[PDB]
Design a protein around this ligand. Sequence first.
Ligand SMILES: Nc1ncnc2c1ncn2[C@@H]1O[C@H](COP(=O)(O)OP(=O)(O)O)[C@@H](O)[C@H]1O
Ligand SMILES: [Mg+2]
Lengths: 65, 189, 190, 265, 256, 61, 47
Amino acid sequence: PSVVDTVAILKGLRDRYEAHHRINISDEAIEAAVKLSNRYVSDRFLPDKAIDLIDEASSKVRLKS
Amino acid sequence: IPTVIETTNRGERAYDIYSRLLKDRIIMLGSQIDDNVANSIVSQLLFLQAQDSEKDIYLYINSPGGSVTAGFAIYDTIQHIKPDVQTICIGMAASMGSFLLAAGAKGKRFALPNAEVMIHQPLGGAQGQATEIEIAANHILKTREKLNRILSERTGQSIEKIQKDTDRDNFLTAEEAKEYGLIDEVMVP
Amino acid sequence: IPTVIETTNRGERAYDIYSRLLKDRIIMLGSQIDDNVANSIVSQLLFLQAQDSEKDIYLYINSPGGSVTAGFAIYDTIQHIKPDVQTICIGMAASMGSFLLAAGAKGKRFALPNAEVMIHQPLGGAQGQATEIEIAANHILKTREKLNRILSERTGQSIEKIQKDTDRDNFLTAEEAKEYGLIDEVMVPE
Amino acid sequence: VIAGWTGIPLTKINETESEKLLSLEDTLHERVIGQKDAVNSISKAVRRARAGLKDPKRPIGSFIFLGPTGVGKTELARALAESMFGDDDAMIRVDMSEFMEKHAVSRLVGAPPGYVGHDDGGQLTEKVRRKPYSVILFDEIEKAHPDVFNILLQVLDDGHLTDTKGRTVDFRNTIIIMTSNVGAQELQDQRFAGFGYETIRKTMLKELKNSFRPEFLNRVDDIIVFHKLTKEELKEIVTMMVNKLTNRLSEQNINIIVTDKAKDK
Amino acid sequence: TGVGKTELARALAESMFGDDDAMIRVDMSEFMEKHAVSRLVGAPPGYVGHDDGGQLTEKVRRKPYSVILFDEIEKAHPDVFNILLQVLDDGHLTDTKGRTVDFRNTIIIMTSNVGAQELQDQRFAGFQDYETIRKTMLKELKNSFRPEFLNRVDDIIVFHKLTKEELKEIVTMMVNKLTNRLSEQNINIIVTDKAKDKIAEEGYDPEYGARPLIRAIQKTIEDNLSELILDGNQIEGKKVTVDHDGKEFKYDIAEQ
Amino acid sequence: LFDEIEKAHPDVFNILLQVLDDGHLTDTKGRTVDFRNTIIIMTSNVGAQELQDQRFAGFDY
Amino acid sequence: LFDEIEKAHPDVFNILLQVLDDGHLTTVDFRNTIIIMTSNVRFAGFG
Ligand SMILES: Nc1ncnc2c1ncn2[C@@H]1O[C@H](COP(=O)(O)OP(=O)(O)O)[C@@H](O)[C@H]1O
Ligand SMILES: [Mg+2]
């Protein structure tokens, strides 16, 4: 999927990950995740790596508190 | 004549000292000016023009002179090419040598301190019938007139003064040549 | 003329003895000074100045003499280039050869122990009309005057004494040349 | 998280990082005395990369360090590696002296299918793949075969190199440095023979064009000529080495001082 | 070099597919060895990597409608181009496994610069136009390639050297692209016509094409903007005007 | 059809010697395939480049 | 022990300089090693 499609996918999946990690995921976080994963991660493919980035960041910030 | 070897990544360059000087755009006129020397010098000047048409060419003169036609060929090649030709007199510049020494670019004709410059009328020879002797004399007088005209145009002196000075062998030091207008300045060490 | 293959690093190139000595800034003058030899010497001096403008050049002189104009060209090139030139007198330095021997850097003119030097007035000839003979005589006299003046400047001796001594062929040993001022010191053996 | 994954400093530029980047020239000069222009160009490339103004489809910078022996080009590359990573061992160093033969290019990208060592890809591609934020040094590029550098053409222009297996490795976050040496004889032979820094730079650059293809030099971001070390620069180099040695012996509790005359000697 | 041979292929790929990525690019600078031909069609049976197949054949099978770019053809071994003889004549390439791949719906572009350097190092030692330049470069192409390979090619095109006005338009295009890229980072940039002309004249180098333009854009715009960004971040959410008063480039910060 | 036979390695055609002389080619499984009812055509242009390269320096089918 | 550093391929000197200047190869440490390199380094005349 394209970048905008991946943004829509991540925004749709936001509710499940907010429920699991008990945090809030901002739209700016979605945009940053998709853009950074698209530019700097080349071995893997867009939706999975964007979701992976979101999940890892959420886990880290949740364990921080 | 010694050999100079230059090492690069691509390979070896084995110059002789004259070719090594030619690499720095130095052309040596160090012998009597005959057809072979004039042809070689013309070819060198043309190649140096081809290699880069903007930098200056350096001509070193140490010669008793020689053929008038050969000197005229060298003069024509010097004047035709776009790059300037600096003429430096080392040792002697006689007959055609002085003519080529004066033929350099303005402000760019030099001579070493104790160098000697000699100007005189061209030598020749006529033999045979009266008509043939007349033809040869007319040709040599025309050649002398052309040389005097070029020298007057190129040194700023009147044609009559050059005619008077070139009647006999006139020996000029570097200072006298600068005053005469043959060279432009003496090269101080 | 033997060849030498000795070169650093790759060691593939071969030199003749004179070209190899040129790399060590050694210049050999072992023949009469004509236009070809003078042109070669001037080219070598310019090449060595380009190679390094600071290191000294070594000039070994062994010559009966030759053209005055060729020696003047060599003298001008020596006095014009930035690097100093050492003149080492091998065998005989006579006529213009002795003039070039005095042309070395001050305090850098040497001579081997059993070496000989000669000084004399320039030779020449004059043929033709009386006017032509007069012109040639004037030229040769002015050349002798200029040579004497340069020798007096480079030896610190009066031009009257040089004129008196150059009247005939004056042969001097290395010690006599040192006392005269043409050279600076006699290269004692090791 | 993405910085931890890729090793690329994608985090926001704080005041400490800002002042560390702005003083990059001083940091490089701490290890490299001399060669102002090379340090300036390298620092400008790094600052441009970290400001977000780099072209995303091209590497951070490609530089050719041309100069004599023992001037500091390799030392400058090592100092840049230390500044960007913290240690010199993180630098990827490719010795061009063992690339004298055309078939040695297989070590960079791999062996073609059906040939030995095809299972293991090229060393450079694997190294860059595992360290996308790296400094790559091509040391003594003159000693290499001229046609080996045709491989780098697709890296300096697009930042992508494809191995034999078909995998594409991105060089878009790397700094590529090539060092070229001109021997003392080499630049002695480049001088003008005749009666009577700018000209030296001009002639060394002109000689460089006669050894490499015009389209290879057209893709290099900057070609920098390393000037010869002067007297005071050598004195400062001695000072810096002595200071390093004094620190290393002071950590052993040995106090040592070197006089100026000794350093000059 | 730097004339637009590869940029034209990328532009065609973008026009046909919407992205420069969707172009099958084969850099032939890695085919300097004859045995590298295995990368196109795969290893013969009984040899390592036989089951992997040919990379180019698999990519073409996966996308029969594509643009294929063979960049810098002169960099490859001469015999490697015999593999393309069947493609240019029948649109077929046979895999090592025996599978025929169809190339009849592809555009094949080959870029070269043979002879281009020869027109620059040619020096006439004795005392031009588009036609003579194209004639001599075509002659060098004939020298570098076999007659049967050149006979199958639909068109051989000579790319002319860029002029001053075209260089100025290229500067305009590069400035527009840089401005659009920096607008995403919330950095509004406007570069005036005098500044663009000074960039074009400063980055002029006739035998290097438009890459000196890239270097000039870097050294003139991007370094100073990077310094301003790193000097306390005085550019964010503001508009920077780049002007050339006549001596140096001036950078002015205002609001949108 | 063997197209452009000069483009192959010279040693490859050693495998066709049995085919052109007996019509037999033994595959690796030890099975002999007969070529005796086949027409074999080999196209080539050897010497084409020599002939467009040959330039006569001194002053037809 | 480097037996006969002479006819070995010249690329060995590269590794030797790398070891002698840094003490590490790509990591393997050489700080506790002793590097011994054993080297093996007609008259046309009357004499
Ligand atoms: N300007 C300088 N500042 C500090 N050290 C220097 C400088 N120039 C040279 N050096 C020292 O000299 C050595 C030069 O070696 P290097 O530059 O790696 O050789 P090469 O340039 O042939 O690769 C380095 O170890 C470095 O410490
Ligand atoms: Mg490019």
